[PDB]
Design a protein around this ligand. Sequence first.
Ligand SMILES: Nc1ncnc2c1ncn2[C@@H]1O[C@H](COP(=O)(O)OP(=O)(O)O)[C@@H](O)[C@H]1O
Ligand SMILES: Nc1ncnc2c1ncn2[C@@H]1O[C@H](COP(=O)(O)OP(=O)(O)O)[C@@H](O)[C@H]1O
Ligand SMILES: Nc1ncnc2c1ncn2[C@@H]1O[C@H](COP(=O)(O)OP(=O)(O)O)[C@@H](O)[C@H]1O
Ligand SMILES: [Mg+2]
Ligand SMILES: [Mg+2]
Ligand SMILES: [Mg+2]
Lengths: 524, 524, 524
Amino acid sequence: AAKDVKFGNDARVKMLRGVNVLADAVKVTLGPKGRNVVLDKSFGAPTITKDGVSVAREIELEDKFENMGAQMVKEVASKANDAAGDGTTTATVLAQAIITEGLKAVAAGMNPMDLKRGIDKAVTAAVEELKALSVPCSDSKAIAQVGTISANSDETVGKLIAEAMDKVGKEGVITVEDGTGLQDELDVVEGMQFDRGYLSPYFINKPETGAVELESPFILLADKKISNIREMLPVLEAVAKAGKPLLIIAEDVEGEALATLVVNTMRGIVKVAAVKAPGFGDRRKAMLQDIATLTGGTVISEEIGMELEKATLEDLGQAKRVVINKDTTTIIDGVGEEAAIQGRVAQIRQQIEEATSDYDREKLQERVAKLAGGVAVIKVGAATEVEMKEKKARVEDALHATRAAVEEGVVAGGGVALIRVASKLADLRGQNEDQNVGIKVALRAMEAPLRQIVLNCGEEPSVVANTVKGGDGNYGYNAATEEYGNMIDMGILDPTKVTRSALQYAASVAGLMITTECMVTDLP
Amino acid sequence: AAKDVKFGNDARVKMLRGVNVLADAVKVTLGPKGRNVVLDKSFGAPTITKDGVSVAREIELEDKFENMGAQMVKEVASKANDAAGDGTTTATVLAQAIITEGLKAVAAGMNPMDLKRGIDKAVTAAVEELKALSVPCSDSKAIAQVGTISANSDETVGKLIAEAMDKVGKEGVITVEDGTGLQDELDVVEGMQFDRGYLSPYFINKPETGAVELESPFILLADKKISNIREMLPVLEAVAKAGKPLLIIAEDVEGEALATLVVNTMRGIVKVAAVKAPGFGDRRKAMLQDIATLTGGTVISEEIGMELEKATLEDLGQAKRVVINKDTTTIIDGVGEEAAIQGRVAQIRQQIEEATSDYDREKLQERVAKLAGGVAVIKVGAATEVEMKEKKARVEDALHATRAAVEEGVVAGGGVALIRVASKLADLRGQNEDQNVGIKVALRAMEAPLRQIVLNCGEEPSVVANTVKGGDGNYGYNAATEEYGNMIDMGILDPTKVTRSALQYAASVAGLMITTECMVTDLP
Amino acid sequence: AAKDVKFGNDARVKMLRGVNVLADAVKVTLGPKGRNVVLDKSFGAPTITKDGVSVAREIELEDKFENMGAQMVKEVASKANDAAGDGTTTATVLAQAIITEGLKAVAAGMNPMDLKRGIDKAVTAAVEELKALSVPCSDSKAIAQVGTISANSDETVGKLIAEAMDKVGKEGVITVEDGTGLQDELDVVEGMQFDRGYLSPYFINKPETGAVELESPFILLADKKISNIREMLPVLEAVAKAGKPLLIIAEDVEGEALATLVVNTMRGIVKVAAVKAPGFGDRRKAMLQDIATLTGGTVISEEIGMELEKATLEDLGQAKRVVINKDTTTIIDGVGEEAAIQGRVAQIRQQIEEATSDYDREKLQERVAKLAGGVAVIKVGAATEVEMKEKKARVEDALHATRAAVEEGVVAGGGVALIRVASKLADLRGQNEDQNVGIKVALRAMEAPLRQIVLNCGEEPSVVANTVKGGDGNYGYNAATEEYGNMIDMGILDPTKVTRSALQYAASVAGLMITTECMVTDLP
Ligand SMILES: Nc1ncnc2c1ncn2[C@@H]1O[C@H](COP(=O)(O)OP(=O)(O)O)[C@@H](O)[C@H]1O
Ligand SMILES: Nc1ncnc2c1ncn2[C@@H]1O[C@H](COP(=O)(O)OP(=O)(O)O)[C@@H](O)[C@H]1O
Ligand SMILES: Nc1ncnc2c1ncn2[C@@H]1O[C@H](COP(=O)(O)OP(=O)(O)O)[C@@H](O)[C@H]1O
Ligand SMILES: [Mg+2]
Ligand SMILES: [Mg+2]
Ligand SMILES: [Mg+2]
């Protein structure tokens, strides 16, 4: 409707207060002793979470100027989650520290643009320092420790995650689903498998649940559905002559083909079962080539140079056996050459490094894992539905944290790494005095994540910080055991990527935020 | 609806206040030390920008009379942006200065219409003076300096821009896109390239990512899509006889043609890949003639005296090789005569000098750059999305500023050129005394852009101006280094076109603005 | 629904105040020193104008009784604009003067109807006096002076207008459009030209921009579109036999005819280009005969006794050459007899004196100018859109003023003519005393336009008027030079038609308005 305009200090104060509301809610969930935050949903049962990004999204303020401040700080928490999926609560804390000190500096009469220059320069230097401190994470023990720390110090989570990564490999795919029982369960899938059931329920080779096992079967792939387009008899009889079972993958199969097929399988003429292709025209067609090559078969290009009849038994691929159920199809092992398997994988490398990243790489990797690696699913056990999402959420954070730790390495936890690097940068200077103050402000803000953890434990945050600063290297305070020692030796690890990202995202938004002279928003 | 009307001073005061609100928000973003303004969007996250035109657009006032004043001053900032895309904040300042002094003169009991004439006459003389001061900008260093100054004194921006203009040439096309990394990147395209990928993924000549390389290929252009429109075999056969690869450009190619084509390419009969034309029929058809002429080929006029089959292999154009991927088609070098290349370019000159200007010239120039010059794309690197728009926006201003500086020349920055010209015009007189005062008022307003920069630096605006006036030529104060010297030697440059345009747009609206006796608006 | 009613003095007072509000806004824009009025639009940006009629339209009052008075006075300004397009502000002033004095007489206890008769009788006598004072405006200098005076003393406007009328002639057509630059530009069209481009882009005779020049072409006119309607070969070949270019005018031409036509032209068999007729069926059909007769050709009546094939080469019209572009078609000179040209013009005289007048005459004259005279278009230069409408609006008023001055002559400006005629009518008497007072009141009101001009100049209106009355003939006060002299010799002219119309429209509504005894309106 009609706008409201605020200038200078009045606008900054409202912005800050809004930021404080967002940050105060987020801070309580930081650390081993962190406390849960409950979000109200009209959708159904209210949510209880310790995840800072989840809390940031739900916070909106009635005061438009305060709300604007909160909305801008919201992004840093959201970006951290996007970059690594962990460290979001810590990133918000840094934004709080930087903003509060920065605004205070602005009040002092210092130029905001220069203060931003100081902060950014300090950030660039701090990032390089983090890289030097970062050490490779490769062994199972280190991987388990990062998972355990991410999941609010839950040993079972780290243990299970480490086993998963070990078993599936570097390019394996790991996901998490709600478990049927209280106990946490790990499921590992071997071979080539997809989520498609069988069109003909009637043909079950032996096990119940609709499990079809074909021994030494031939595999058929096609680009069209079959109704009265039954004609394929010379292909079918060729298989009948062989006396071997047939597996069919295509857009669809209709009852006319299925009806004759069922009698043929029961009578003993041929043992044949069929299943639908993966899903969408481009989606299913793309995944057909790998199935055929893996089994040594040839895909029938209805669209291109091939016809339904036009195909020889030799075209069909070979596999040891397959498993089929109402919702899933599995192939134990297609027989094909490694050079062909690797060649399929080699062409995937361009696919792997793609501009799109999100929703590109994720599906793409899954094909890759199926082609030569393995797929792992983790089940989460909880007595109640609300307990279940909290438990599962933390597990995902640990899952993402391990992925980040492996690729970029790890640094000491408890916020020790940021405070330790700050001492190193104590001699860093900018173009002018305002920049020097901005640099100093950023270093000052680095300390805050460490002290929030201590604050949440009900202990003097400044006191612990002074003792930690006094020490050297990886020395720090363990909130869980309320004592000082080597953070790395205690199993407390922070992946380098999340630590780096938290600092950079917090600083980027904070630098711009502190420079705001005037704000424009709608009237109440 | 019911109307509210104000007469004389009451209407002017309300108008002035509206103007002041709009201008005050705009002023803080002027200079090396300028401060950012944050605009609230319901659309998504809030926007932070130093661009005055962006800020002017978003300002609306609750008071209808004040709002009307702001809306009228909004146009000067917007028109300046349309003219050259830079100096919008500076133009707003001049409007502020002129209006405030002009209204004061009106209060004094002076006829407003005469004051407007005085201002306009002074402006006309000032413009001529600017032209005399303006010197040609031809070297890379000068171009870089204007880009660097435009982009809030960022040396890298000016450097990257200058390299681009040098590489592409005078008629080359330069654009800016968001970069994947944190580093600014420059991309240069050589030869003829377009944004359409290949219909047949199946034929890849060698490199991965769908890259197709045809060696000494023949190029075919058509005005019709092909389904069962397979016929053209004798043209195809002729190419097969030749033993050379074929490139196809048309509205579309269907699977039937693609199907036979894929097998033919695989068996080695012919190596042929097809790519879709540019897009819109008036669009792609227009761009077809140049492709053909460049490669020495003939476009097939399905519409006119030509037929699908009717065409000899000789009709087809030739090129060294082409590069094709999923979303892009490139031709290394078609072999055609310069007279044909230039002739296509010569006919473009009418196209260049077009009344529409906006949109018509932009697409048109892009064809031109591809035909004989080069095309450059600049990527912008930033830690966050909000940082990215700010960073990218400034780069565009510098890009536009360089374009303006090359064509109309440059003048000394820091507002020195307007203040320096004002001293020259101190002896300018109008028809009567009221006009003389109007002239004097305009000269007085010229000083303001200089002093706003100083004001934003926390220094006495009048003090710096007095010393600057005392000097001669290009002598002035450098806000960034807080010292006095030759503005041109330092590297602070203002394109003549933006300087001229800012002054003229500000004055045009302001003269009308100060002559308002009565205002009419809807009730609150 | 329910209404509020008022009687006598209470109703008249409310009416008067409404009138005063409307008139006060209008008065400030009267004279060389007149001040601008700004109107708020929800359409887009606000409008700034000195045109009284524009201001009157936008004024509406919250008080229903006051609003009713304003609505009635609005019409006089609007009717004056319709009659001549100028003097609307002056007419409103007369209504103000007459109404205020008339109401005062009603207050005195005199019959209003008699006052009306007195006013009307004085008006009738005043009109006759104006006719006697009116002298013919025939020279370029007098025309320029009226244009310049109308355009708020802008010499360039009068100069450009006079040149336009001189060049085009008495029956020529002059229009005004927004210019492409900051300078006023005049465009004159010689010969026969229309706003239709070519259907076949392919045939361009020589100059770039789609320009087609046919040398000694034959012109063909038709009543239907051509698709498969290609047949007309013997007509076409007859031209081919001749070896001359062909110009085609019809409802439409389709690609079948155009495709063959392009190839025939390309090899030099025939040089033929085709364009579309003027517009709507009746519109294009009406203007076809003149084109044919002008070029000596015959129109093909598909509708009547003629057929597509049925037409000889001799039936085709002949012209020296034609010019064609994408949006326009021009013929240098068709060869036809003057008696036929004049005969076409002679039949137009019935068309010229038409009851419809508005729209009918405007389009009709344009045909007339094209047939034997010329067409002129004036472009208006400005830096901003708002500046552009004000500048253009005044130019149109001057254009209308010159048109009015030529046909009915001119009288001395500055309001001298009305005040001078009033002295003459000082001895005029009615049937009774109340009528005598009404007459005297009207004469009294005549003085007001003169004094508003002086009032707007900040000088004693009564003092100037007393000296003006004291003088003889064309003696008067020049507001622009602040001195007394002969108004005609100083170049200040008022077209007789606007002066007469202003007085008559003002008085007609005012006479009825002063006689109102009771008003009825809706409740607040
Ligand atoms: N038991 C612990 N002792 C010391 N530090 C811990 C302990 N548990 C977690 N931390 C640290 O505190 C940080 C915040 O924990 P977390 O809730 O996971 O926040 P994120 O959600 O990671 O901001 C960790 O990244 C880690 O370095
Ligand atoms: N460091 C500087 N010292 C002196 N003058 C400067 C400096 N930097 C920029 N300027 C000048 O002040 C003007 C305003 O800067 P800018 O923010 O780009 O505003 P526009 O957006 O150009 O109004 C410039 O066009 C230039 O002439
Ligand atoms: N410079 C001048 N000196 C004296 N009288 C003038 C001058 N300019 C215009 N006038 C007169 O005052 C009248 C009003 O001017 P104008 O603004 O054009 O009103 P209209 O809009 O014509 O009522 C004119 O018609 C003319 O007679
Ligand atoms: Mg965590
Ligand atoms: Mg700029
Ligand atoms: Mg006028």
